[model samples]
Target chain A: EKSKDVINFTAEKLSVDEVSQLVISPLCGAISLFVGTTRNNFEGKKVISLEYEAYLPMAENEVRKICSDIRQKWPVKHIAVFHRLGLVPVSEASIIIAVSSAHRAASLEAVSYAIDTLKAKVPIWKKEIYE
Target chain B: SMVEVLYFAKSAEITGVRSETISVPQEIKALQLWKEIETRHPGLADVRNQIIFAVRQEYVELGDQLLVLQPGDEIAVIPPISG
Candidate 1:
């Protein structure tokens, strides 16, 4: 059986396909995904790159709480969340969330809420490198 | 007992090290250890009230000063994060 929830932290590149695949199944008709990339600009500054770090263990526990919270509020069957650490270039994905449900609305709303909650709760930090 | 104090982000910047083992008074809990930190790095005092402290991966309350430290336990200070 596929794991109901997947949480990972790594310095490697985040693959949209890899993350999205975790939430796909014959039982679910909808898979909603959210991927946050390092943008080239922040507040008018020319961001050259971004640096991400985490208190790894605590960060994972906090995101796990987010996943559990998602299950509580929505009819999500599977949820996958990953956050990258170390240097990330502009246009590279830094975080990804994918959720699958029998319908579109629940998965869609869950992905949005998941990311928002992660920012508020996870002990992850990102610093922008400006030119 | 000595607990390893790990600093991150801005805290690491102030302490000039990512982690250090510091000796504390017997029965010292997070709050008292935090006080020792302020004593050693006066600069840490700037964010003492604002910092988030964790011991053995659990967020701790400063009010839990009596929370007792174990030798070689891992403690960390995480300031407000931007991610």
Candidate 2:
């Protein structure tokens, strides 16, 4: 188990490199990361941008819960889940999840679980700005 | 007693206000409160089912919307979390 757990809920732009760095360690052989960017289009419509919001405390709590569940399922060394709130333009990073473990399989699985779980359960909402 | 109802994102945009204080009788349920809000502000009806409600910053399950609410508690009308 890692000493520090990183879970951030912010309105600022999420940095993939900065968040990935938090999971770095000598004991971990692999570090897997996922970055969710605001795409230019949703369906065939031109998406000018996306507006994101959260219930603050509850949003943070859900993210923490996701991380806890990940730890239980995998022998992971460290994990970071950072999701940005407010307006995010196309191509900008909105959320970043990084996981590190002694092997590749656990890290990859944990990272995938975090993003899927976040989208399905977390109390964060987004509005698609159409052109 | 008074209970505060806060709106966010699309809910706020529809209501044209972010929050309001409503006079609700004791032992009132969340669903009933939401119904009253819709009656007062018809715009909320658009997202009635899609909207979510949170009390004191904690999410209230859809089935639990009928749970009793207390005075001084704040309720938030949350639209779908697409983020």
Candidate 3:
């Protein structure tokens, strides 16, 4: 978001740069971005693709709750969560979660916590499509 | 009347008729209804293994007790895990 400070969310293929720039405010000294890319192989076997189906509205609601929890657990200045849907190819970013804080430790810890909990507890699950 | 559930992608395309109701001849069980459904729509063969039956959002095993579907009650038929 291009303002004093605001939240911008989207469900498209997102660039880490936009999130980096948006979260990096004067009040924030450290900005951390995490991206998960697709790969062609799984468990030493040939993998064709992946289909990630989710209850869109429920997934977004969970992500929002995650960000809120991070703010409570860590002193983060900004946070954003973006997820893409549909057929996604390998080496393409499927998830982007960014967090900014006055220091690096809080930002990094918060980002790691977000991704970890999201994978384990979130309602979203990706089905690995093998060739 | 009993709620009906469908399996696979067919459920989405064939809406408004996936589930309906009929007076039970007696205390018909879940498996009895399954046979009746197969007779009506052979397409369910596409996701026989993937088909899941749920009542009030809880899973139902083939032999599990069946909850008589009442009006305003809803049941979901989840598709098989995408491969």
Candidate 4:
């Protein structure tokens, strides 16, 4: 089978609709997506914005490995992991993970694992700007 | 030999530089290389345990493993990832 992984670490805003469209397939019945947004507060601190930086080559490679791991664990179809770099204001998405599968259970679980693993493995960092 | 070391996040904030070319032995242990970097920027020692040391874009354990680095190779210092 061909590769259906769409991994990107861009300096632009992440679009949930756009990322979801990349993973939508006629063969898959479910498209599960996880959008990680910058919140307004953290630990009682008023977070004005979040700045993200990444080793792009390694970060993208790690996300590709996550897609591969999900394929091995579940019968998932296309996978898209888009992460936004630079400054992200409150309530804006910093990352998006979308996975399509023939069943809901597989896609749902894969999306969760994708986000968790991405956090632990990907070479991306975020610095919160407080008010 | 010389390699390009890229620092990100907290590491960059500590070092005050994004990337730099550093000289070191071509055949050296991973820890030795890390020490060489720390010698240049003492502030990096604070995040030594939490950072990921990568060579040629591949993760390298911060232990006694021989690394045969080439000139112009990209070595990266990555701190705790939040994404």
Candidate 5:
């Protein structure tokens, strides 16, 4: 099967199972996942939630670029990146990324690179709501 | 020429407007364009160093390079991303 990329930016809650399923492929043995959740605290503040915003068109484009970059760097089969917009309460997922590859190392490293590069390049932002 | 400028995160909060259109020289330096926006919303200067100033949906360094903008081109003032 040809490699696949799924990119989503939504106001709905993120699901680990759903995201993982998108990258699952019979041709790939290892599936790596990264889930970023909102924390209850930041520094000394008691955070209630996080408000995420993005320039959807550009954000999606940047993510697609990241996915393409990953394909160039690793032998991955499928990639899925989902980012939640609007409000996310504590412990709720803000982002989820899944990658599949024939071996463990490629999927593992690709997932890491995806999140790190995403933070630096994607046009997404989050504001902490304090108690 | 006219260009549409978008603000996000703290920049949006400071400007109090998500986006706006303004007239500027078609062939202006990147920093000059940024300064024009800053002139409208002086509060943006606070995050100057932390922003990603993009022109036509592409990230541009906030420096002396000239940008030949087209009418309605998108200029975005993106604050440090927390995603």
Candidate 6:
């Protein structure tokens, strides 16, 4: 991650692999991950895809805040978050969050809280699809 | 009286509308008000996952039957499927 593990991909999906690489820190003793995915949902109609929109800089700030808060709240060693934007199909569009700690509960709580808070406060929108 | 709650994430996305207010009987519990909300926002009716309520900034349970909600409570319906 020294050269900056930040990356962008033209994906029909997301990756835990790329995420895992971000937190492969030496002091890390545990790892926790959460992924948010899209689904086929419509108002009694069929949906084919979902378009996600994000103001990149602001969205990243929110993610960083969530990650920083998790560390302050827990005995976490490392944390990482990845969210994909654009047209995502059903069961696709994923937001991956991971935390590593010496214990289990802290990581779990932090990851869950990060996702929940981000979804509530984050400036990102998704248009759903169903079929 | 009516209470309006903000919807976010999935709820807002599906409904294509941001917020809704519903009128319930006087001195209704949180659960009953929840039913009122679910009825008003048909999009939430089928969502099995629990949505939390906040009277102020703290989270309240839908099953907290004894907790009565009055007018202008600033209630919010927060779906769990967030990230």
* Fnat scores for every prediction: 0.62, 0.62, 0.00, 0.92, 0.81, 0.19
Q: Between prediction 4 and prediction 5, which has the larger DockQ?
A: 4
lDDT of 5 at B11: 87
- What's the ranking of the predictions by DockQ, best on top? 4, 5, 1, 2, 6, 3
Q: For each predicted model, how many residue pairs clash, with residues at least 3 apart or on different chains?
A: 0, 5, 0, 0, 0, 2
Top lDDT model: 5
Question: Model 3 over residues A73-110: C-alpha lDDT tens digits?
Answer: 98888787766666667777777878888899998998
Clashing pairs in 2: A125-B81, A125-B82, A125-B83, A126-B82, A126-B83
* Local accuracy of candidate 2 as per-residue lDDT tens digits, B29-64: 767877789987997888888887787777785453
- Candidate 1, clashing residue pairs? none
- Using lDDT as the yardstick, the better of models 5 and 6 is 5
Worst 10 residues of 2 chain A by lDDT: A1-10
- What are the per-residue Cα lDDT tens digits for candidate 5 across B4-79? 9999878888999999999998899999998899999999888888887878777888999989999989999888
* Model 4 Cα lDDT, one tens digit per residue, B1-83: 88999998788889999999999889999999899999999988889888768898889888999999999999998777777
**TM-score of model 3 (CA atoms):** 0.60
Model 5 clash pairs are: none
What is candidate 6's lDDT per residue for A1-131, written digit by digit as tens? Answer: 23122323233478788787776666666778887666565776777787765534545765666666776788877677777777776666467877777777877897889778987866566666556
Q: lDDT tens string, model 4, A40-84? A: 999998999999888878888988888888999999999998889
When summed lDDT is taken over every stretch of 10 residues in candidate 4 chain B, the lowest stretch is B74-83
In model 3, the runs with Cα more than 4 Å from the true position are A1-11, B1-83
Q: Write the per-residue lDDT of candidate 5 for residues A48-86, one digit (tens) a residue.
A: 999998887889999999999999999999999999999
lDDT of each candidate versus the true structure: 0.86, 0.83, 0.63, 0.89, 0.91, 0.66
Candidate 5 ranges beyond 4 A from true positions: none
Select the stronger candidate by DockQ from 1 and 2. Answer: 1
TM-score of chain B of each: 0.85, 0.84, 0.57, 0.95, 0.94, 0.75
Report the candidate with higher lDDT, 1 versus 4: 4
